[PDB]
Design a protein around this ligand. Sequence first.
Ligand SMILES: CC(=O)N[C@@H]1[C@@H](O)[C@H](O)[C@@H](CO)O[C@H]1O
Ligand SMILES: CC(=O)N[C@@H]1[C@@H](O)[C@H](O)[C@@H](CO)O[C@H]1O
Ligand SMILES: CC(=O)N[C@@H]1[C@@H](O)[C@H](O)[C@@H](CO)O[C@H]1O
Lengths: 256, 256, 256
Amino acid sequence: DDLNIRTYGATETSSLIMLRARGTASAPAAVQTGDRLGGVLFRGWNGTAWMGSGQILSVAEENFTTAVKTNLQFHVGGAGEAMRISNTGNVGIGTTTTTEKLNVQGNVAVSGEITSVRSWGIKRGPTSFSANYINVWNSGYHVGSSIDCTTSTTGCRILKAGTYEIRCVQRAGTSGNSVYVGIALNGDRTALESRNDVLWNHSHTAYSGSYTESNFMGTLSANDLITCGAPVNTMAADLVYAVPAYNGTMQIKRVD
Amino acid sequence: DDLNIRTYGATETSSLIMLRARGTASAPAAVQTGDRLGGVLFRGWNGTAWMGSGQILSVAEENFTTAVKTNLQFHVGGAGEAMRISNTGNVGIGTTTTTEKLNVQGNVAVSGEITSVRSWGIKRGPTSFSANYINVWNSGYHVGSSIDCTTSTTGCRILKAGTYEIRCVQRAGTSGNSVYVGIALNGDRTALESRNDVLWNHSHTAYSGSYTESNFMGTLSANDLITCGAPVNTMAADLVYAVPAYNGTMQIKRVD
Amino acid sequence: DDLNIRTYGATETSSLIMLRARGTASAPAAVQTGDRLGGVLFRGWNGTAWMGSGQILSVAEENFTTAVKTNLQFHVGGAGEAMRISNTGNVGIGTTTTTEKLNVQGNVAVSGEITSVRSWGIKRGPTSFSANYINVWNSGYHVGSSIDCTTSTTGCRILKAGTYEIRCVQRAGTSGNSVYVGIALNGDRTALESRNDVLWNHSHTAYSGSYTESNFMGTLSANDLITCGAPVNTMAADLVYAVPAYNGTMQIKRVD
Ligand SMILES: CC(=O)N[C@@H]1[C@@H](O)[C@H](O)[C@@H](CO)O[C@H]1O
Ligand SMILES: CC(=O)N[C@@H]1[C@@H](O)[C@H](O)[C@@H](CO)O[C@H]1O
Ligand SMILES: CC(=O)N[C@@H]1[C@@H](O)[C@H](O)[C@@H](CO)O[C@H]1O
């Protein structure tokens, strides 16, 4: 009891066409949001009834007098709706929320490798001491949409809530005195160091040209400005302030 | 000719319905595992035969008298089956094994950015010496499912086989002696360091408040306990043991 | 009303079959590249016309007398074509250029975790000084396809354009003199350090067994050989050259 559609020709093709209107044939009305345009439905005998065995649906996502917008839905026997393609082209697997081009509710296993754009940012060349834990940096650079290291000379602005890994280093001067730097939230070191869900640390150093370092790992909020510098001005005097990046840098990587 | 299904009105829709049973119309039997519920088949003349030119199948994944579980399969002329949606809603691309929500047998190329949960964990605040290469840590924290840094005070348990990048640092005290720490597998440094598929290193330091560092990068196994500490009890007396994380930390990131 | 296909039996199934040939039934001719084999088309009334409301198409990608190759196309009302499955099985979401098994033209959002192969590589055991900023390394190791750290003893070769995070450390000897190492592009430090789109830094050290470190973050070109070493022979004499990896390493991770 198959259904065959056979077409011979240079430009002709076979079509199964499912059409939907509201109203009647002589008085049709426009499709409304949520209306099903049509579906391919599979059903299987289990011994008692014809059970849902998957389906492929086209469903309106806008009233058609405004715009023709639809989604495609793929359902399986068992889980139900498994995949959705929205009118924007965004795809959801395991979710109907199609915010990004691909949205997976669950884990993803890839046998090969993944390439993508990665948000990261840097500051280079500590040129002066602005405030406790706030160096002024000679330049910044960044990639992606999560971090902005170029707008402000005194830090990197987090643009999106997320998890970040941060390392700041600066060279000690020639005095032989103990120096250190620390990563801070707009110069507030305790705001990061006191959290139970982060790593925050820093070392001391004294040998000329060696690094003191500070590290941070954890979540940050949109509009947070991350800074780094000496804890106090008198210690800043014993650190190297100059343009070359080898004198000191901050590096921020978006981890998730 | 084209097959058109046209539906008007407020409640109904156009539906191509494919139904499958075993036995006969008189003696219907339940669908069995591997039975095809139905399909949309595309065929094309190549001069010799009507060749497989793509198809969308619904197939039973279980005897329906047991459970109604189906998959949807998308095949193309050339590679054959290309994508599968199992009864769990899990999707395989280039593979029929749908362990996770999405599984890709191959590489993935993304033009934008990817957000997900990234497994990482930390120990902070080395407060006593437990054993060679094992500090007791005041607290731990972790994110995700691969690393457990809270159950035990003397290290982080690797919960999933994978690749990890680990850095451990600790401050020298005031003795002036050369000190160091090392990352180890439950106190066994050699079990990590002697492998030809890993990075393992460590530095010495002596300046008060300077950091001695140890690094590892490589695969670890489920149930591994990663520790870090001084190599012998006598050197521990020359390292800083106290609660604040700037005195010492261990950080573990899952890389793959 | 609905179109029902129903089949009872153990061998056959219910199937909509769309067949395409060129020529005529009396003289059929092979399908040609670009020919539509068939489609499942949805259409909806918008007030004045039956508008395209999504469709699933099978389309030839090759002249069938050469080879049977098709793609499957998923179109929604609004964006038009949203997903392509090429004859290779490669899937494109928002792109028809299906270079990898899965290609996404946009961002990806995953609620869980992603596992994949990660390109990374290392060099261990600085054994001798080959030239400025080029140590010879006793061994290397790598995983993935972006980086080769074993073919050349003097560095890691970048095999794919990408963004890389690199850290090089080496132990100071016992001279008491200031020492440092630097990461370089086959010995050329300036080729990396002078770029406005990268991080490049290095520290000094003098304590025996402590690390001098150099760091890099940024894009690199295929065929780049990344080296690390002392800036001149007389400073190499003041660094530790020996086989154990704790004497010196280089670590490279592909970031994107
Ligand atoms: C101790 C010190 O500052 N020495 C610097 C060195 O670090 C720097 O790499 C080089 C410029 O290439 O200039 C030297 O004078
Ligand atoms: C060890 C040292 O000399 N200096 C520490 C400094 O590292 C620490 O960060 C600060 C409290 O925040 O307390 C000082 O005593
Ligand atoms: C003073 C010195 O160099 N000590 C080394 C130590 O760095 C190294 O980690 C260990 C190997 O287990 O062998 C010791 O001799």
